[PDB]
Amino acid sequence: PVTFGKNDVEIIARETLYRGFFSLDLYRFRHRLFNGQMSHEVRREIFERGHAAVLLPFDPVRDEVVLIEQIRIAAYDTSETPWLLEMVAGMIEEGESVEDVARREAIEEAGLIVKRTKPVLSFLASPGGTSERSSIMVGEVDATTASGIHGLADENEDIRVHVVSREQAYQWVEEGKIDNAASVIALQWLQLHHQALKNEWA
Amino acid sequence: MLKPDNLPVTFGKNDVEIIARETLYRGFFSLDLYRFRHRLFNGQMSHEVRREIFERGHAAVLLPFDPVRDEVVLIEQIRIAAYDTSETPWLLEMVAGMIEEGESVEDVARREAIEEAGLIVKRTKPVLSFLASPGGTSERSSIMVGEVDATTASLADENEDIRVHVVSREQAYQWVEEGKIDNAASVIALQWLQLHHQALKNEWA
Ligand SMILES: Nc1ncnc2c1ncn2[C@@H]1O[C@H](COP(=O)(O)OP(=O)(O)OC[C@H]2O[C@@H](O)[C@H](O)[C@@H]2O)[C@@H](O)[C@H]1O
Numbered sequence: 321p322v323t324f325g326k327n328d329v330e331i332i333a334r335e336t337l338y339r340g341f342f343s344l345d346l347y348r349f350r351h352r353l354f355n356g357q358m359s360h361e362v363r364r365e366i367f368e369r370g371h372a373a374v375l376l377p378f379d380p381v382r383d384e385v386v387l388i389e390q391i392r393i394a395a396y397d398t399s400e401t402p403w404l405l406e407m408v409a410g411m412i413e414e415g416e417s418v419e420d421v422a423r424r425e426a427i428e429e430a431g432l433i434v435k436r437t438k439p440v441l442s443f444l445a446s447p448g449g450t451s452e453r454s455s456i457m458v459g460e461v462d463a464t465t466a467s468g469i470h471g472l473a474d475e476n477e478d479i480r481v482h483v484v485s486r487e488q489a490y491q492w493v494e495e496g497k498i499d500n501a502a503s504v505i506a507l508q509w510l511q512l513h514h515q516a517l518k519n520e521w522a
Numbered sequence: 523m524l525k526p527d528n529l530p531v532t533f534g535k536n537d538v539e540i541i542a543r544e545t546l547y548r549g550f551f552s553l554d555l556y557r558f559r560h561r562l563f564n565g566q567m568s569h570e571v572r573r574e575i576f577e578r579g580h581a582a583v584l585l586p587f588d589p590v591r592d593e594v595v596l597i598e599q600i601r602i603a604a605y606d607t608s609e610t611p612w613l614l615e616m617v618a619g620m621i622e623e624g625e626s627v628e629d630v631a632r633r634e635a636i637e638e639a640g641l642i643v644k645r646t647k648p649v650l651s652f653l654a655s656p657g658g659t660s661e662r663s664s665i666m667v668g669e670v671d672a673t674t675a676s677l678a679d680e681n682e683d684i685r686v687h688v689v690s691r692e693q694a695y696q697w698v699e700e701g702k703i704d705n706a707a708s709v710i711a712l713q714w715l716q717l718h719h720q721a722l723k724n725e726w727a
């Protein structure tokens with residue numbers, strides 16, 4: 321498939337245009353064109369924010385999924401409401417493993433203790449403007465135990481847990497009611513492998 | 523008065539107030555800071571919360587599908603941001619382009635099919651619109667399936683920056699499973715296609 325590699329690109333320099341909580345960097349490079357020749361110098365504004373771990377809580381016995389509801393204002397301008405239905409997720413820090421961030425966030429966000437876990441897919445959200453990569457895991461859970469609303473809330477992570485059938489959640493994806501990349505991808509994956517996973521677990 | 527719209531979540535836009543958006547950095551792509559308050563599930567109202575959001579516009583995505591030959595037309599192109607976490611910055615993607623003012627998702631998809639892959643799309647069909655990573659970017663991408671004759675492979679206009687690859691639907695999907703195609707729009711598009719190919723082929727028969 322892909323011909324070219326890292327030796328076919330010369331990164332001239334990287335510069336931080338802005339550095340706050342996240343970073344906005346500028347990549348200046350030259351690369352091979354699809355005719356051999358090397359291009360001129362190209363500039364790219366790249367959003368640097370680290371990488372994420374995602375966990376799809378799936379109850380094989382009940383054939384259910386556990387969703388996380390929390391506000392995401394970046395969704396404001398193009399959605400009817402900023403509050404989205406999502407998967408458990410968290411940023412991967414200094415040498416943490418994807419599985420551990422996923423399992424830890426399952427406790428913090430949904431109050432669930434994941435049992436067996438399995439790798440699904442790893443994707444780049446939008447490779448044209450950000451370096452962010454998200455790695456999905458499917459974790460065996462007991463929907464029956466998820467937490468409820470926090471009396472005293474975490475204001476930068478106020479979550480409401482939703483438990484729904486596997487089919488329901490998938491239909492919402494097709495209907496557009498669930499439309500964040502991690503959820504759409506994980507839920508489509510589940511829809512293509514649910515019987516094999518149900519047979520493997522329990 | 524008319525009844526309120528239905529929501530699959532607890533709160534709507536009337537439950538959140540945006541104090542302001544200040545520009546942290548300005549370029550054709552910008553990084554802004556949203557300052558806002560919102561109702562909490564416990565029934566109270568939050569203190570000001572601040573978020574850095576990547577403003578980069580929105581994209582139109584086209585999945586080139588030949589239902590008769592059961593093939594898919596991919597596009598190879600360099601994505602430098604994929605560099606630090608990928609074996610090669612050259613990815614296999616879907617036809618895609620930025621949506622401009624007064625342009626529909628379909629018009630962009632159709633225009634992009636021609637200049638990126640030299641394809642002329644016939645019937646189109648909405649697939650899905652998704653938020654790439656809503657916690658830090660506002661970017662929204664709308665996908666469509668474009669009926670195409672895979673034999674119309676092409677050189678295109680941007681053949682020096684983009685190379686087309688015509689493959690079977692099954693090979694495309696197998697590459698998604700193996701991690702050989704891992705960019706969001708392509709993964710979502712191809713999984714949707716693996717779930718609907720028969721109905722779509724019957725429809726476009
Ligand atoms: N970070 C950037 N900085 C400067 N120029 C850019 C950038 N991103 C794209 N461009 C330039 O513009 C051309 C394409 O611009 P767009 O219209 O934005 O289309 P595309 O780059 O393919 O973005 C669409 C697809 O990639 C994902 O990032 C996004 O989620 C969408 O699925 C490219 O050839 C490239 O040279």
Ligand SMILES: Nc1ncnc2c1ncn2[C@@H]1O[C@H](COP(=O)(O)OP(=O)(O)OC[C@H]2O[C@@H](O)[C@H](O)[C@@H]2O)[C@@H](O)[C@H]1O
Nearest residue numbers: 341372409410411476477502572573574575655656657658
């Ligand atoms: N835009 C932002 N600006 C400033 N602080 C932020 C922002 N986003 C998150 N934070 C801070 O970091 C914490 C979030 O940590 P994580 O749990 O790691 O982030 P998360 O919200 O889960 O975002 C990762 C998930 O959302 C998508 O953007 C991404 O694809 C991934 O699936 C929050 O408590 C908040 O204080």
